[PDB]
Protein backbone atom coordinates (compact mmCIF):
# COMPACT_ATOMS: atom_id res chain seq x y z
CA UNK A 1 0.00 0.00 0.00
CA UNK A 2 1.98 2.76 1.28
CA UNK A 3 5.06 1.27 0.74
CA UNK A 4 3.31 0.90 -3.05
CA UNK A 5 3.16 4.17 -2.92
CA UNK A 6 6.65 4.90 -2.31
CA UNK A 7 8.29 2.89 -4.72
CA UNK A 8 6.11 4.56 -7.26
CA UNK A 9 7.63 7.65 -6.59
CA UNK A 10 11.10 6.79 -6.84
CA UNK A 11 10.18 5.23 -10.27
CA UNK A 12 9.32 8.64 -10.94
CA UNK A 13 11.51 10.21 -14.06
CA UNK A 14 13.89 12.31 -12.37
CA UNK A 15 12.32 15.31 -13.99
CA UNK A 16 8.85 14.89 -12.49
CA UNK A 17 7.29 16.88 -10.06
CA UNK A 18 6.12 15.15 -6.99
CA UNK A 19 2.60 16.55 -5.15
CA UNK A 20 2.93 17.82 -2.14
CA UNK A 21 1.35 14.77 -0.53
CA UNK A 22 3.87 13.11 -2.52
CA UNK A 23 6.67 14.97 -0.82
CA UNK A 24 5.53 15.31 2.35
CA UNK A 25 5.56 10.89 2.21
CA UNK A 26 8.69 11.02 1.51
CA UNK A 27 10.24 13.34 4.21
CA UNK A 28 7.97 11.02 6.74
CA UNK A 29 9.90 7.58 5.47
CA UNK A 30 13.31 9.12 5.04
CA UNK A 31 15.35 7.01 6.98
CA UNK A 32 13.37 4.06 5.78
CA UNK A 33 15.18 5.27 1.71
CA UNK A 34 18.59 5.36 3.17
CA UNK A 35 19.79 2.42 1.75
CA UNK A 36 17.83 3.26 -1.67
CA UNK A 37 20.50 4.79 -4.29
CA UNK A 38 17.45 5.74 -6.58
CA UNK A 39 15.39 7.41 -4.01
CA UNK A 40 17.90 10.21 -2.64
CA UNK A 41 16.83 12.65 -5.40
CA UNK A 42 13.69 12.21 -4.54
CA UNK A 43 14.18 12.83 -0.71
CA UNK A 44 16.36 15.98 -1.88
CA UNK A 45 13.83 17.00 -3.91
CA UNK A 46 11.29 17.43 -1.12
CA UNK A 47 13.84 19.53 1.58
CA UNK A 48 13.13 22.94 2.56
CA UNK A 49 16.99 24.38 1.86
CA UNK A 50 15.43 28.04 2.97
CA UNK A 51 15.44 26.69 6.58
CA UNK A 52 18.89 26.43 8.15
CA UNK A 53 17.48 23.41 10.60
CA UNK A 54 15.93 21.34 7.68
CA UNK A 55 18.96 21.28 5.63
CA UNK A 56 21.14 20.14 8.36
CA UNK A 57 19.04 17.27 8.76
CA UNK A 58 19.07 16.79 5.01
CA UNK A 59 23.12 16.99 4.82
CA UNK A 60 22.95 14.77 7.10
CA UNK A 61 20.71 11.74 5.37
CA UNK A 62 22.89 12.81 2.34
CA UNK A 63 26.35 11.48 4.40
CA UNK A 64 24.22 8.47 5.49
CA UNK A 65 22.92 7.51 2.34
CA UNK A 66 24.02 4.78 0.00
CA UNK A 67 26.16 6.75 -2.76
CA UNK A 68 23.52 7.81 -6.04
CA UNK A 69 24.57 6.59 -9.45
CA UNK A 70 26.41 9.06 -11.79
CA UNK A 71 23.62 9.53 -13.62
CA UNK A 72 21.42 10.46 -10.96
CA UNK A 73 24.06 13.02 -10.49
CA UNK A 74 22.92 14.93 -13.68
CA UNK A 75 19.61 15.88 -12.07
CA UNK A 76 21.88 17.52 -9.03
CA UNK A 77 23.95 20.20 -10.89
CA UNK A 78 20.68 21.40 -12.68
CA UNK A 79 19.07 25.28 -11.40
CA UNK A 80 16.66 23.38 -9.12
CA UNK A 81 19.38 22.26 -6.51
CA UNK A 82 21.30 25.36 -5.35
CA UNK A 83 22.29 23.92 -2.06
CA UNK A 84 25.80 24.15 -2.51
CA UNK A 85 26.58 20.82 -0.66
CA UNK A 86 24.41 18.82 -2.62
CA UNK A 87 26.00 20.46 -5.69
CA UNK A 88 29.45 19.72 -4.73
CA UNK A 89 27.99 16.09 -3.69
CA UNK A 90 26.69 15.80 -7.02
CA UNK A 91 30.49 16.67 -8.45
CA UNK A 92 31.92 13.85 -5.86
CA UNK A 93 29.96 11.76 -7.43
CA UNK A 94 30.61 12.37 -11.23
CA UNK A 95 34.31 12.18 -10.30
CA UNK A 96 33.46 8.54 -9.82
CA UNK A 97 32.63 8.16 -13.88
CA UNK A 98 35.89 7.79 -16.43
CA UNK A 99 36.76 10.33 -19.02
CA UNK A 100 34.78 8.10 -21.75
CA UNK A 101 31.31 8.43 -20.27
CA UNK A 102 32.24 12.05 -18.81
CA UNK A 103 33.08 13.43 -22.58
CA UNK A 104 29.11 12.00 -23.27
CA UNK A 105 27.70 14.70 -20.67
CA UNK A 106 30.41 17.48 -20.84
CA UNK A 107 28.41 19.47 -23.56
CA UNK A 108 25.49 19.53 -20.83
CA UNK A 109 27.61 19.81 -17.64
CA UNK A 110 29.03 23.31 -19.76
CA UNK A 111 25.44 24.38 -19.56
CA UNK A 112 25.28 23.57 -15.60
CA UNK A 113 27.93 26.04 -15.26
CA UNK A 114 25.02 28.65 -15.39
CA UNK A 115 23.85 27.22 -11.83
CA UNK A 116 27.04 27.09 -10.41
CA UNK A 117 28.17 30.27 -7.77
CA UNK A 118 29.74 32.84 -10.04
CA UNK A 119 31.57 34.51 -7.19
CA UNK A 120 33.45 31.52 -6.52
CA UNK A 121 34.43 30.78 -10.07
CA UNK A 122 35.67 34.55 -10.79
CA UNK A 123 37.43 34.32 -6.62
CA UNK A 124 39.25 30.93 -8.18
CA UNK A 125 41.42 34.02 -10.50
CA UNK A 126 44.63 34.76 -9.08
CA UNK A 127 45.54 38.39 -8.65
CA UNK A 128 32.68 12.25 -0.36
CA UNK A 129 35.21 14.89 -0.83
CA UNK A 130 33.11 18.32 -1.61
CA UNK A 131 36.48 20.78 -2.01
CA UNK A 132 35.36 21.35 -5.97
CA UNK A 133 32.40 22.89 -7.59
CA UNK A 134 31.93 22.43 -11.33
CA UNK A 135 34.02 25.07 -12.73
CA UNK A 136 37.03 23.41 -10.98
CA UNK A 137 36.47 20.06 -11.41
CA UNK A 138 36.16 20.16 -15.29
CA UNK A 139 39.08 22.06 -15.54
CA UNK A 140 40.93 19.37 -13.57
CA UNK A 141 40.16 16.71 -15.41
CA UNK A 142 40.60 18.76 -18.63
CA UNK A 143 43.81 19.42 -17.57
CA UNK A 144 44.76 15.45 -17.47
CA UNK A 145 42.74 14.75 -20.75
CA UNK A 146 43.43 16.44 -24.10
CA UNK A 147 40.76 15.32 -25.42
CA UNK A 148 38.26 16.73 -22.69
CA UNK A 149 40.27 19.92 -22.93
CA UNK A 150 39.65 20.27 -26.74
CA UNK A 151 35.83 19.88 -26.05
CA UNK A 152 36.24 22.05 -23.11
CA UNK A 153 37.89 25.06 -24.82
CA UNK A 154 35.52 25.19 -27.73
CA UNK A 155 32.32 24.15 -25.46
CA UNK A 156 33.35 27.22 -23.41
CA UNK A 157 34.25 29.55 -26.30
CA UNK A 158 30.92 29.43 -28.31
CA UNK A 159 29.50 30.10 -24.74
CA UNK A 160 31.75 33.29 -24.38
CA UNK A 161 31.03 34.44 -27.96
CA UNK A 162 27.14 34.42 -27.33
CA UNK A 163 25.78 37.47 -28.75
CA UNK A 164 22.44 36.59 -27.31
CA UNK A 165 23.64 35.87 -23.74
CA UNK A 166 25.87 38.86 -23.88
CA UNK A 167 23.10 41.32 -24.28
CA UNK A 168 20.17 39.53 -22.32
CA UNK A 169 22.59 37.59 -19.43
CA UNK A 170 25.71 39.94 -18.86
CA UNK A 171 26.47 38.36 -15.57
CA UNK A 172 26.23 34.69 -16.95
CA UNK A 173 28.45 36.21 -19.41
CA UNK A 174 31.14 37.17 -17.89
CA UNK A 175 30.92 34.02 -15.97
CA UNK A 176 31.77 32.08 -19.09
CA UNK A 177 34.65 34.68 -19.46
CA UNK A 178 35.78 33.53 -16.44
CA UNK A 179 35.88 29.95 -16.71
CA UNK A 180 37.90 30.19 -19.99
CA UNK A 181 40.06 32.65 -18.05
CA UNK A 182 39.94 30.00 -15.34
CA UNK A 183 41.12 27.31 -17.72
CA UNK A 184 43.82 29.26 -18.96
CA UNK A 185 45.26 29.54 -15.59
CA UNK A 186 45.33 26.25 -14.81
CA UNK A 187 47.09 25.34 -17.99
CA UNK A 188 49.48 27.83 -17.43
CA UNK A 189 50.33 26.46 -14.27
CA UNK A 190 50.35 22.68 -14.96
CA UNK A 191 53.51 20.36 -15.86
CA UNK A 192 54.77 20.54 -19.31
CA UNK A 193 52.52 18.48 -21.03
CA UNK A 194 49.65 20.77 -19.46
CA UNK A 195 51.17 23.82 -20.54
CA UNK A 196 51.78 22.69 -24.38
CA UNK A 197 48.01 22.14 -24.28
CA UNK A 198 47.54 25.66 -24.25
CA UNK A 199 49.73 26.72 -27.19
CA UNK A 200 47.79 23.74 -29.14
CA UNK A 201 44.18 25.49 -28.51
CA UNK A 202 45.70 28.27 -29.40
CA UNK A 203 47.06 27.16 -32.49
CA UNK A 204 43.16 25.68 -33.31
CA UNK A 205 41.74 29.36 -32.08
CA UNK A 206 44.23 30.76 -35.17
CA UNK A 207 43.53 28.22 -38.06
CA UNK A 208 39.44 28.57 -37.52
CA UNK A 209 40.41 32.27 -37.72
CA UNK A 210 42.01 32.06 -41.25
CA UNK A 211 39.40 29.43 -42.34
CA UNK A 212 36.88 31.90 -41.42
CA UNK A 213 38.85 34.17 -43.20
CA UNK A 214 38.89 32.37 -46.08
CA UNK A 215 35.48 31.60 -46.34
CA UNK A 216 34.81 35.46 -46.96
CA UNK A 217 36.93 36.24 -49.12
CA UNK A 218 36.10 33.35 -51.16
CA UNK A 219 33.00 34.76 -51.25
CA UNK A 220 34.65 37.55 -53.02
CA UNK A 221 35.02 35.98 -56.36
CA UNK A 222 31.58 37.46 -57.67
CA UNK A 223 31.86 34.50 -60.43
CA UNK A 224 30.09 31.29 -60.60
CA UNK A 225 30.29 28.68 -57.89
CA UNK A 226 33.00 26.88 -60.31
CA UNK A 227 34.68 30.36 -60.04
CA UNK A 228 34.44 30.21 -55.99
CA UNK A 229 35.64 26.80 -56.20
CA UNK A 230 38.92 28.26 -58.03
CA UNK A 231 39.05 30.98 -55.69
CA UNK A 232 38.76 28.51 -52.52
CA UNK A 233 41.30 26.38 -54.14
CA UNK A 234 43.77 28.95 -55.15
CA UNK A 235 43.52 30.63 -51.60
CA UNK A 236 44.00 27.43 -49.66
CA UNK A 237 47.20 26.57 -52.37
CA UNK A 238 49.10 30.04 -50.67
CA UNK A 239 50.25 28.85 -47.35
CA UNK A 240 52.13 31.89 -47.20
CA UNK A 241 49.13 33.87 -46.61
CA UNK A 242 46.40 31.85 -45.29
CA UNK A 243 48.39 29.54 -43.74
CA UNK A 244 45.54 26.62 -43.96
CA UNK A 245 47.80 24.38 -46.19
CA UNK A 246 51.25 23.42 -44.15
CA UNK A 247 50.46 23.61 -40.64
CA UNK A 248 52.25 22.11 -37.08
CA UNK A 249 50.06 18.99 -36.53
CA UNK A 250 47.10 20.63 -34.56
CA UNK A 251 44.54 18.40 -33.04
CA UNK A 252 41.44 18.69 -35.39
CA UNK A 253 39.04 20.80 -33.21
CA UNK A 254 35.94 18.24 -34.49
CA UNK A 255 37.62 15.41 -33.54
CA UNK A 256 40.74 16.14 -31.42
CA UNK A 257 42.58 12.61 -31.82
CA UNK A 258 42.64 13.35 -35.35
CA UNK A 259 46.02 15.28 -35.75
CA UNK A 260 46.08 17.02 -39.04
CA UNK A 261 49.09 19.08 -41.16
CA UNK A 262 46.24 21.16 -43.41
CA UNK A 263 43.95 21.34 -45.66
CA UNK A 264 44.22 19.51 -49.32
CA UNK A 265 43.57 22.82 -51.50
CA UNK A 266 42.73 20.69 -55.11
CA UNK A 267 40.16 19.50 -53.99
CA UNK A 268 38.13 21.74 -51.66
CA UNK A 269 34.89 22.75 -53.22
CA UNK A 270 31.54 24.79 -51.86
CA UNK A 271 28.17 22.88 -51.64
CA UNK A 272 25.46 24.16 -53.90
CA UNK A 273 23.15 25.57 -51.18
CA UNK A 274 21.96 29.10 -49.53
CA UNK A 275 24.90 29.33 -47.25
CA UNK A 276 27.41 27.68 -49.90
CA UNK A 277 29.07 25.70 -47.10
CA UNK A 278 32.66 23.96 -47.97
CA UNK A 279 33.90 20.42 -48.10
CA UNK A 280 37.21 19.92 -46.91
CA UNK A 281 39.72 17.70 -46.58
CA UNK A 282 42.36 17.37 -43.86
CA UNK A 283 45.80 16.17 -43.91
CA UNK A 284 46.07 13.95 -41.33
CA UNK A 285 49.02 12.82 -39.58
CA UNK A 286 49.93 9.29 -40.99
CA UNK A 287 48.88 10.43 -44.62
CA UNK A 288 45.26 10.08 -44.92
CA UNK A 289 42.23 12.36 -45.52
CA UNK A 290 39.55 13.65 -43.11
CA UNK A 291 36.70 14.97 -45.03
CA UNK A 292 34.89 17.67 -42.91
CA UNK A 293 31.87 20.37 -43.86
CA UNK A 294 32.62 23.62 -42.68
CA UNK A 295 29.73 26.09 -42.19
CA UNK A 296 29.53 29.78 -41.97
CA UNK A 297 26.74 31.78 -40.95
CA UNK A 298 24.92 29.60 -39.34
CA UNK A 299 24.56 28.80 -35.68
CA UNK A 300 24.92 24.45 -35.49
CA UNK A 301 25.06 24.41 -31.50
CA UNK A 302 21.47 22.85 -32.24
CA UNK A 303 22.66 20.23 -34.29
CA UNK A 304 25.62 19.96 -32.41
CA UNK A 305 23.14 18.79 -29.37
CA UNK A 306 21.14 16.34 -31.74
CA UNK A 307 24.49 14.57 -32.86
CA UNK A 308 25.72 14.48 -29.17
CA UNK A 309 22.63 12.62 -27.99
CA UNK A 310 22.68 10.57 -31.09
CA UNK A 311 26.07 9.48 -30.30
CA UNK A 312 25.33 8.99 -26.69
CA UNK A 313 22.10 6.86 -27.62
CA UNK A 314 24.23 4.83 -29.96
CA UNK A 315 27.09 4.11 -27.35
CA UNK A 316 24.03 3.07 -24.83
CA UNK A 317 22.73 0.53 -27.81
CA UNK A 318 26.03 -0.41 -27.88
CA UNK A 319 26.32 -1.05 -23.99
CA UNK A 320 23.45 -3.39 -24.03
CA UNK A 321 25.22 -5.24 -27.29
CA UNK A 322 22.75 -3.58 -29.78
CA UNK A 323 24.70 -2.02 -32.84
CA UNK A 324 21.96 -0.79 -34.94
CA UNK A 325 24.54 0.69 -37.65
CA UNK A 326 24.04 4.59 -36.91
CA UNK A 327 26.19 7.45 -38.16
CA UNK A 328 26.08 9.78 -35.49
CA UNK A 329 28.58 11.79 -37.71
CA UNK A 330 30.52 14.83 -35.25
CA UNK A 331 29.61 18.58 -35.02
CA UNK A 332 31.32 21.12 -33.62
CA UNK A 333 30.12 24.67 -33.15
CA UNK A 334 33.50 26.97 -33.02
CA UNK A 335 31.44 29.97 -32.60
CA UNK A 336 27.80 30.82 -32.60
CA UNK A 337 28.29 31.90 -36.01
CA UNK A 338 30.11 28.80 -37.77
CA UNK A 339 31.35 25.51 -37.00
CA UNK A 340 32.34 21.78 -38.45
CA UNK A 341 30.42 18.85 -39.32
CA UNK A 342 32.36 15.44 -40.08
CA UNK A 343 31.29 15.01 -43.76
CA UNK A 344 29.81 11.44 -44.39
CA UNK A 345 30.37 10.06 -48.33
CA UNK A 346 26.29 9.37 -49.03
CA UNK A 347 23.55 10.25 -51.75
CA UNK A 348 20.68 11.44 -50.31
CA UNK A 349 17.78 9.67 -50.68
CA UNK A 350 15.91 12.17 -53.12
CA UNK A 351 18.69 11.77 -55.03
CA UNK A 352 18.96 7.92 -55.21
CA UNK A 353 14.92 8.04 -56.12
CA UNK A 354 15.72 10.30 -58.87
CA UNK A 355 18.80 8.43 -60.44
CA UNK A 356 17.76 4.92 -59.72
CA UNK A 357 14.25 5.06 -59.15
CA UNK A 358 14.36 2.86 -55.45
CA UNK A 359 16.68 2.42 -52.60
CA UNK A 360 15.97 -1.27 -53.43
CA UNK A 361 17.63 -0.36 -57.21
CA UNK A 362 20.64 1.48 -55.78
CA UNK A 363 21.41 -1.76 -53.13
CA UNK A 364 21.03 -3.81 -56.09
CA UNK A 365 23.30 -1.49 -58.61
CA UNK A 366 26.14 -1.29 -55.91
CA UNK A 367 25.59 -3.89 -53.76
CA UNK A 368 24.11 -7.28 -55.55
CA UNK A 369 23.84 -10.80 -54.34
CA UNK A 370 22.46 -13.25 -56.70
CA UNK A 371 21.20 -15.52 -53.34
CA UNK A 372 20.31 -12.26 -51.19
CA UNK A 373 17.35 -10.95 -49.67
CA UNK A 374 15.81 -9.12 -53.70
CA UNK A 375 18.94 -9.59 -55.16
CA UNK A 376 20.79 -7.60 -52.64
CA UNK A 377 23.47 -8.22 -50.06
CA UNK A 378 21.91 -9.80 -47.23
CA UNK A 379 25.19 -7.77 -45.26
CA UNK A 380 23.72 -4.01 -46.82
CA UNK A 381 20.16 -5.19 -46.13
CA UNK A 382 20.65 -6.16 -42.63
CA UNK A 383 22.47 -2.48 -42.04
CA UNK A 384 19.30 -1.06 -43.77
CA UNK A 385 17.33 -2.57 -41.50
CA UNK A 386 18.83 -1.92 -38.69
CA UNK A 387 19.92 1.84 -39.18
CA UNK A 388 16.41 2.33 -40.24
CA UNK A 389 15.34 1.00 -36.90
CA UNK A 390 17.80 2.79 -34.75
CA UNK A 391 16.64 6.12 -36.51
CA UNK A 392 12.61 5.54 -36.50
CA UNK A 393 13.19 4.87 -32.69
CA UNK A 394 15.35 8.05 -32.02
CA UNK A 395 13.91 10.52 -34.41
CA UNK A 396 10.39 9.88 -32.57
CA UNK A 397 11.90 9.99 -28.70
CA UNK A 398 13.81 13.58 -29.83
CA UNK A 399 10.73 14.57 -31.98
CA UNK A 400 12.57 15.34 -35.22
CA UNK A 401 10.48 17.20 -37.87
CA UNK A 402 11.31 18.55 -41.37
CA UNK A 403 11.62 15.10 -42.56
CA UNK A 404 12.04 14.68 -46.08
CA UNK A 405 14.48 12.76 -48.91
CA UNK A 406 16.71 15.46 -49.01
CA UNK A 407 17.33 15.11 -45.20
CA UNK A 408 17.93 11.31 -45.59
CA UNK A 409 20.95 9.76 -46.31
CA UNK A 410 21.89 6.34 -47.22
CA UNK A 411 25.35 4.64 -47.96
CA UNK A 412 26.47 2.44 -50.38
CA UNK A 413 26.32 -0.29 -47.29
CA UNK A 414 22.99 -0.04 -46.43
CA UNK A 415 23.75 3.09 -43.78
CA UNK A 416 20.65 4.99 -43.96
CA UNK A 417 20.71 8.16 -41.13
CA UNK A 418 19.08 11.86 -40.93
CA UNK A 419 20.98 15.32 -41.21
CA UNK A 420 20.05 18.75 -40.54
CA UNK A 421 17.81 19.28 -37.71
CA UNK A 422 16.78 22.34 -37.43
CA UNK A 423 12.66 20.91 -35.98
CA UNK A 424 13.33 18.99 -32.98
CA UNK A 425 11.40 18.57 -29.94
CA UNK A 426 7.56 18.37 -32.09
CA UNK A 427 8.43 21.34 -33.83
CA UNK A 428 7.62 21.01 -37.60
CA UNK A 429 6.83 23.55 -40.47
CA UNK A 430 3.60 21.57 -41.29
CA UNK A 431 0.65 20.81 -38.73
CA UNK A 432 -0.32 17.68 -37.80
CA UNK A 433 2.81 15.99 -37.72
CA UNK A 434 3.04 11.85 -38.13
CA UNK A 435 4.42 10.73 -34.77
CA UNK A 436 6.60 8.25 -36.21
CA UNK A 437 8.68 9.39 -39.33
CA UNK A 438 8.80 5.96 -41.77
CA UNK A 439 8.07 7.49 -45.46
CA UNK A 440 7.20 4.52 -48.38
CA UNK A 441 10.82 4.81 -49.65
CA UNK A 442 11.60 3.49 -46.21
CA UNK A 443 9.71 0.83 -46.06
CA UNK A 444 9.77 -0.13 -50.04
CA UNK A 445 13.78 -0.17 -49.61
CA UNK A 446 13.54 -2.76 -47.18
CA UNK A 447 10.81 -4.96 -49.48
CA UNK A 448 7.37 -4.09 -48.60
CA UNK A 449 5.67 -4.43 -45.46
CA UNK A 450 4.87 -8.38 -46.47
CA UNK A 451 8.58 -8.59 -46.30
CA UNK A 452 10.39 -10.51 -42.91
CA UNK A 453 13.04 -7.72 -42.76
CA UNK A 454 9.89 -5.23 -42.34
CA UNK A 455 9.12 -7.73 -39.11
CA UNK A 456 12.69 -7.46 -38.44
CA UNK A 457 12.44 -3.86 -38.91
CA UNK A 458 9.84 -3.59 -36.20
CA UNK A 459 11.25 -6.30 -33.65
CA UNK A 460 14.70 -4.10 -34.15
CA UNK A 461 12.22 -1.15 -32.97
CA UNK A 462 10.75 -2.40 -30.04
CA UNK A 463 14.17 -3.48 -28.88
CA UNK A 464 15.74 0.30 -28.96
CA UNK A 465 12.72 0.98 -27.36
CA UNK A 466 12.70 -0.70 -24.64
CA UNK A 467 16.66 -0.48 -24.27
CA UNK A 468 16.73 3.63 -24.33
CA UNK A 469 13.85 3.51 -21.94
CA UNK A 470 15.92 1.95 -19.34
CA UNK A 471 17.92 5.04 -19.61
CA UNK A 472 15.50 7.62 -19.49
CA UNK A 473 16.66 8.97 -16.31
CA UNK A 474 20.36 9.17 -18.05
CA UNK A 475 18.88 11.32 -21.13
CA UNK A 476 16.24 13.59 -19.37
CA UNK A 477 18.67 14.70 -17.00
CA UNK A 478 20.91 15.68 -19.55
CA UNK A 479 17.92 17.31 -21.16
CA UNK A 480 17.40 19.39 -17.99
CA UNK A 481 20.43 20.70 -18.53
CA UNK A 482 19.97 21.88 -21.31
CA UNK A 483 16.60 23.61 -20.94
CA UNK A 484 18.68 27.12 -20.17
CA UNK A 485 20.93 26.64 -23.35
CA UNK A 486 20.40 29.21 -26.21
CA UNK A 487 19.06 26.43 -28.66
CA UNK A 488 16.15 27.61 -31.14
CA UNK A 489 13.67 24.71 -30.31
CA UNK A 490 14.56 24.20 -26.92
CA UNK A 491 13.74 28.41 -26.08
CA UNK A 492 10.60 27.89 -27.83
CA UNK A 493 8.94 26.33 -24.66
CA UNK A 494 11.90 25.54 -21.97
CA UNK A 495 9.34 24.35 -19.42
CA UNK A 496 8.00 21.74 -21.46
CA UNK A 497 11.28 20.37 -23.27
CA UNK A 498 11.99 18.03 -20.71
CA UNK A 499 8.23 16.60 -20.59
CA UNK A 500 8.14 16.23 -24.31
CA UNK A 501 10.86 13.56 -24.68
CA UNK A 502 9.87 12.31 -20.59
CA UNK A 503 6.25 11.54 -22.86
CA UNK A 504 8.02 9.80 -25.89
CA UNK A 505 9.53 7.30 -23.26
CA UNK A 506 5.96 6.36 -22.14
CA UNK A 507 7.29 5.07 -18.75
CA UNK A 508 3.66 4.89 -17.66
CA UNK A 509 3.61 1.83 -19.80
CA UNK A 510 5.28 -1.81 -19.10
CA UNK A 511 7.63 -3.25 -21.04
CA UNK A 512 5.06 -5.38 -22.91
CA UNK A 513 2.67 -2.30 -23.09
CA UNK A 514 5.40 -0.42 -24.61
CA UNK A 515 6.24 -2.92 -27.18
CA UNK A 516 2.20 -2.90 -28.29
CA UNK A 517 2.90 0.61 -27.76
CA UNK A 518 5.39 0.97 -30.60
CA UNK A 519 4.20 -1.76 -32.80
CA UNK A 520 0.55 0.19 -33.18
CA UNK A 521 2.95 3.15 -33.69
CA UNK A 522 4.61 1.82 -36.51
CA UNK A 523 1.67 -0.35 -37.84
CA UNK A 524 -0.46 3.37 -38.06
CA UNK A 525 2.47 5.40 -39.75
CA UNK A 526 2.77 3.10 -42.34
CA UNK A 527 -1.13 3.00 -42.75
CA UNK A 528 -1.09 6.13 -43.33
CA UNK A 529 1.65 5.93 -45.69
CA UNK A 530 -1.06 3.29 -47.85
C1 LIG B 1 24.17 16.24 -51.81
C2 LIG B 1 23.62 17.44 -51.32
C3 LIG B 1 23.79 17.80 -49.99
C4 LIG B 1 24.52 16.96 -49.13
S1 LIG B 1 24.90 17.14 -47.42
C5 LIG B 1 25.82 15.55 -47.42
C6 LIG B 1 26.44 15.12 -46.16
C7 LIG B 1 27.39 14.07 -46.01
N1 LIG B 1 27.79 13.89 -44.71
N2 LIG B 1 27.08 14.83 -43.99
C8 LIG B 1 27.07 15.12 -42.62
C9 LIG B 1 26.25 16.12 -42.15
C10 LIG B 1 25.44 16.85 -43.07
N3 LIG B 1 25.43 16.61 -44.37
C11 LIG B 1 26.24 15.60 -44.84
N4 LIG B 1 25.81 14.99 -48.61
C12 LIG B 1 25.08 15.76 -49.60
C13 LIG B 1 24.90 15.40 -50.95
CL1 LIG C 1 -1.43 17.92 -3.31
CL1 LIG D 1 9.08 18.84 6.17
CL1 LIG E 1 29.32 26.46 -7.01
CL1 LIG F 1 44.57 19.82 -26.46
CL1 LIG G 1 22.16 36.13 -14.94
CL1 LIG H 1 52.25 24.67 -31.04
CL1 LIG I 1 30.39 31.49 -46.56
CL1 LIG J 1 30.42 18.53 -52.41
CL1 LIG K 1 25.18 28.75 -55.29
CL1 LIG L 1 29.11 15.57 -32.08
CL1 LIG M 1 25.75 12.69 -53.55
CL1 LIG N 1 19.37 26.07 -36.03
CL1 LIG O 1 4.46 22.17 -35.35
K1 LIG P 1 30.31 7.50 -37.69
K1 LIG Q 1 12.29 13.05 -55.30
Known amino acids: ATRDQLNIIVSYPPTKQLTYEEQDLVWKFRYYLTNQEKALTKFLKCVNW ?82 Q ?107 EKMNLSDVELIPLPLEPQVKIRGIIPET ?47 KLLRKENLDLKLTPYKVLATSTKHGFMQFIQSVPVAEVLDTEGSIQNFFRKYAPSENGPNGISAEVMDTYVKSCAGYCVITYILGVGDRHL ?50 EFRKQCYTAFLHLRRYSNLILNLFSLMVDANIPDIALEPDKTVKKVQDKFRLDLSDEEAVHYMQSLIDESVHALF
Not at 85 to 90: D, E, I, K, L, M
Not at 182 to 206: E, I, N, W
Not at 298 to 313: A, E, G, H, T
Not at 420 to 437: S, V
Request: proline letters at 4%.
Open 50 to 131: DLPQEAKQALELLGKWKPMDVEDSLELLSSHYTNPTVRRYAVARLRQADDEDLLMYLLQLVQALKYENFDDIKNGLEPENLE
Open 133 to 239: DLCTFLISRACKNSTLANYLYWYVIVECEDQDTQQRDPKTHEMYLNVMRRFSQALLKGDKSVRVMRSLLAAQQTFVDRLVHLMKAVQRESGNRKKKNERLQALLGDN
Open 268 to 314: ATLFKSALMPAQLFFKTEDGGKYPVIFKHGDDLRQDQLILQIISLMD
Open 406 to 455: DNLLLTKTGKLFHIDFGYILGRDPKPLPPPMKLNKEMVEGMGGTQSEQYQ
